[PDB]
Design a protein around this ligand. Structure first.
Ligand code: 0U7
Ligand code: 0U7
Lengths: 114, 115, 114, 115
C-alpha cells in the first residue's frame, strides 16, 4: 500500500541505500514511528506496511538526504526531505511517494493508483 | 536574511496568501516557533527575521500548501511542504527558499548568498 | 534500451495515453523520426527501440503535453515538452526519461542504469 | 515582456552566464531566430524583446544547459532545455520562464501576468 522511490538528479540514477523513516501522527500531535528501511539498488523501498496496518491518518516520510550526499562527498543544503500527507480511503489504494534529489533542491510527487 | 518565494504550477502565477511558519530547533530538541507570515501578491515573503536574530541553528520552513489549495477549493495531497536546513554555521548568509506547488507535488530549492 | 515514464502532478497519477515522439538528429542537423507511441495505463512507453537500432547520437523525446491537458479540460502553457540528450556508449546501457507534468510547469530527469 | 531566470540546484545559486536563444515559428513552420542573450550574476536575462516586437506566435526558449555545465567542467545529460509555448494570443502578457538545473535533470515553470 505504501512505496517510496528516490532518484538522484546529479548522477542520473536511483538513490541507493538512502534511509527512510515513516511516522504516523498520534492523537497528541506527536510523530510515532511507523516503518523504516533503506532504499534498494533500484531506489525503492517496499514492504513498509500492510493494508491492515495502513489506516487513514497523517503520515510523514522522512528521507535522509544529508547522509546520502555526504557519502558522495557533496555538501547539501537540507537536513532531510519530509513528505507529510493524509492517507484517505475514499481515494485510490496504493501510494507511491517519489522524490528527486539534488544537493540544494528536491522535488516530490505522489502517484496514487488502484 | 531569509526570504520565501512560492509559485503555482497550475495557474502559472505567484502563489499568493500562502501561510509560512518558521521554527528553530532548541537545545532540548524541540521546534521553537521563530517567525511567520504570508506571501504577498508577488508570492514573496520578506521581513521574517533580522541578521541579529537569525543566528546559527537548524531551521524548519513550513509552507502551508494544504491551506493554500483548500482556500482555492482544491483537495491536495500534502499537508504542507517542510524545508529543514542548517543556517549560518559558517557565518551569516542570505537564504531564499523557493517552492513550486501542484496539488500532488512540490519542488523546493534554496539560493544561498554571502553578503 | 529506452523507456519513457510520464506522471501527472495535478491528479497524482500516471499520465495515460500521452503521445510521445522520438527523433534522432541527422547529419544535416534535421530531426528524423525514430520511434513513437502512447503511454500506457502506468504512464510508460516501452518498446521504442532495440539495442541494435539505438546507436550513439542526439535524440529528442517530444511529449504531447498540450493534448493531454486539453483532454482534461485544462488550458496549459506549453506546446509540448522536449527532452534532448546524447546517447553515449561509455555510460550505462538503459535510459529512462521521466517527466512530471503540471499545466504551467514540467520537470524531467534521466535514470541511466546497467 | 519576456524574462528568463535560471537557478543551479547543485550550488544553490543563480546559474550565471547561461546562454539563451529564443526562436519564433514562421508561417512556413521553420524556427526563426528571435532574440538571444545570457543570464547575469543574478541568473536573470532581461531585454530580449519589446512589447512591439513580441507579437502573437509560438516561441521556443532554448536554455543552453550543456554549455553551462561543460563551462563548469561537468558532463551533463541534456543538450539544452527547450520551453515551447504560444504567447500573446489573448493580447499582450508578460512572461517569466524559470528553470532549475541539475546535471541529469531540469524543471521549468512559467509565470504569466497581465499588465
Ligand atoms: S517506474 O516505477 O519504473 C519509474 C522509473 C523511473 C522513474 C520513475 C519516477 N517516479 N517518480 C519520478 C519523478 C519524480 C519527480 Cl519528483 C520528478 C521527476 Cl522529473 C520524476 O520518476 C518511476
Ligand atoms: S525573480 O525573483 O525575478 C524570479 C521570478 C520568477 C520566478 C523565480 C523563481 N524562483 N524559484 C523558482 C523555481 C523554483 C523551483 Cl523549486 C522550480 C522552478 Cl522551475 C523555479 O523560480 C524568481
Amino acid at each position: 500500500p505504501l512505496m517510496v522511490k528516490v532518484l538522484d538528479a546529479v548522477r542520473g540514477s536511483p538513490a541507493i541505500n538512502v534511509a527512510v523513516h515513516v511516522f504516523r501522527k498520534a492523537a497528541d500531535d506527536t510523530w510515532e514511528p511507523f516503518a523504516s528501511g533503506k532504499t534498494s539498488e533500484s531506489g525503492e523501498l517496499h514492504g513498509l506496511t500492510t493494508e491492515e496496518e495502513f489506516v487513514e491518518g497523517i503520515y510523514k516520510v522522512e528521507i535522509d538526504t544529508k547522509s546520502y550526499w555526504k557519502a558522495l562527498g557533496i555538501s547539501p543544503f537540507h537536513e532531510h526531505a519530509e513528505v507529510v500527507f493524509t492517507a484517505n480511503d475514499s481515494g485510490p489504494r496504493r501510494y507511491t511517494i517519489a522524490a528527486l534529489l539534488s544537493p540544494y533542491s528536491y522535488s516530490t510527487t505522489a502517484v496514487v493508483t488502484n
